[PDB]
Amino acid sequence: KVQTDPPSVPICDLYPNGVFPKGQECEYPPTQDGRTAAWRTTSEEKKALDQASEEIWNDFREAAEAHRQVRKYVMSWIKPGMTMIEICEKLEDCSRKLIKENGLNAGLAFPTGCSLNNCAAHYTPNAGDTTVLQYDDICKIDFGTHISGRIIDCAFTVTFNPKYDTLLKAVKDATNTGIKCAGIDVRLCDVGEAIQEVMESYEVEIDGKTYQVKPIRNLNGHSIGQYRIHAGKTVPIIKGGEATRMEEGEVYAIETFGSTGKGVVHDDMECSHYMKNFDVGHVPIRLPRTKHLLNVINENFGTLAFCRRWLDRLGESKYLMALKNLCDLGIVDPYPPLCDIKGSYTAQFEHTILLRPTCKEVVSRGDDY
Ligand SMILES: Cc1ccc(NS(=O)(=O)c2ccccc2)c(C(=O)O)c1
Numbered sequence: 001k002v003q004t005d006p007p008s009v010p011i012c013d014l015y016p017n018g019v020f021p022k023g024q025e026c027e028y029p030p031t032q033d034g035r036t037a038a039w040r041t042t043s044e045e046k047k048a049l050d051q052a053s054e055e056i057w058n059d060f061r062e063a064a065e066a067h068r069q070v071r072k073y074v075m076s077w078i079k080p081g082m083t084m085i086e087i088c089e090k091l092e093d094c095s096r097k098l099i100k101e102n103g104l105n106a107g108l109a110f111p112t113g114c115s116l117n118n119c120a121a122h123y124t125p126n127a128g129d130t131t132v133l134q135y136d137d138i139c140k141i142d143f144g145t146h147i148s149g150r151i152i153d154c155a156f157t158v159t160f161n162p163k164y165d166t167l168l169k170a171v172k173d174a175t176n177t178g179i180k181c182a183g184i185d186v187r188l189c190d191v192g193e194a195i196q197e198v199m200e201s202y203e204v205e206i207d208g209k210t211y212q213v214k215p216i217r218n219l220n221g222h223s224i225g226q227y228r229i230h231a232g233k234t235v236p237i238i239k240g241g242e243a244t245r246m247e248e249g250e251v252y253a254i255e256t257f258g259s260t261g262k263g264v265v266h267d268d269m270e271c272s273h274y275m276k277n278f279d280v281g282h283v284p285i286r287l288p289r290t291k292h293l294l295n296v297i298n299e300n301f302g303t304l305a306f307c308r309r310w311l312d313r314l315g316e317s318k319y320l321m322a323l324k325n326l327c328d329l330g331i332v333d334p335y336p337p338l339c340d341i342k343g344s345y346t347a348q349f350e351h352t353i354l355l356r357p358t359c360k361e362v363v364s365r366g367d368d369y
């Protein structure tokens with residue numbers, strides 16, 4: 001009863017029983033008294049709690065399998081010479097098909113980030129962007145999928161010149177350290193301190209200059225909520241930050257960013273990412289164009305992030321002022337590209353993890369990273 005598998009068959013159609021593959025399952029890290037998590041691994045009480053939200057975990061897994069298959073595909077063809085628009089459209093086209101896009105029930109969780117070099121996040125081309133990926137570019141591919149609002153935020157870094165190899169290794173190791181440190185009752189600040197320690201243990205040499213990799217201090221991981229990419233809690237990336245503990249049942253985006261610059265990002269370049277304020281309720285709007293755009297946003301994205309290209313594909317035109325109005329009203333928030341100093345290089349690696357009652361599941365883990 002098999003069939004096609006190349007990037008064209010929806011993940012849902014690949015599993016008739018509706019049960020999707022689990023990600024990497026890890027035992028929760030010990031504590032002071034060396035209290036391991038071997039007991040919680042099968043605990044009858046926890047096993048029940050976990051099984052109670054099996055439908056939720058399952059949805060994350062379906063979205064994760066889509067993410068794994070989409071990215072494996074992307075890595076096979078992304079090459080310098082392609083425009084950033086060509087890259088994002090080809091990736092998104094596949095993502096939409098594998099996730100079996102269905103309105104707000106299944107689809108793309110957020111725009112395809114493809115931030116270059118000193119820019120670390122939130123850059124995706126808008127219409128007319130002629131930017132071309134270069135051999136020496138360090139591109140952060142950050143895209144998301146979701147099933148019923150259960151979001152998979154996962155990212156990796158693309159390079160073609162081996163000179164960035166140790167920088168990527170540093171960030172990948174830092175992210176895996178954060179993933180290993182994460183757990184129920186674990187203080188967020190400890191995760192950040194652990195991440196910084198690993199990150200900074202790496203020194204790299206690029207074009208004759210040496211650098212001690214720096215975590216981007218004002219960037220971080222975050223808890224994830226249904227249809228809410230950033231539920232409220234933040235996972236630092238450096239020491240001294242977040243005096244809160246991770247809790248059972250929570251879901252986190254564990255990401256780290258390393259940089260050869262100041263280790264700080266600032267808003268720069270034209271904005272492409274936007275997202276309705278999760279807390280803003282219904283707001284009556286009479287302005288025709290603004291009213292229509294808000295309706296389009298509510299129908300197609302809800303509280304999920306979107307980009308200008310996604311408005312263009314829906315047939316919307318000359319909507320910039322309306323979009324600005326929504327932002328000025330506080331109904332929608334702009335999320336411009338976040339970049340370090342000109343000339344610097346930034347790298348990123350990210351995974352979504354489920355803090356399940358019985359274990360810690362790195363649901364987006366793959367054979368690649
Ligand atoms: C639109 C949007 C809103 C919030 C987000 N989460 S975040 O603020 O913790 C964040 C994380 C990493 C880079 C930049 C921002 C993200 C995201 O995880 O990138 C995207």
Ligand SMILES: [Mn+2]
Pocket residue numbers: 142143153154155255350
């Ligand atoms: Mn991300």
Ligand SMILES: [Mn+2]
Pocket residue numbers: 153221222253255350
């Ligand atoms: Mn994230």
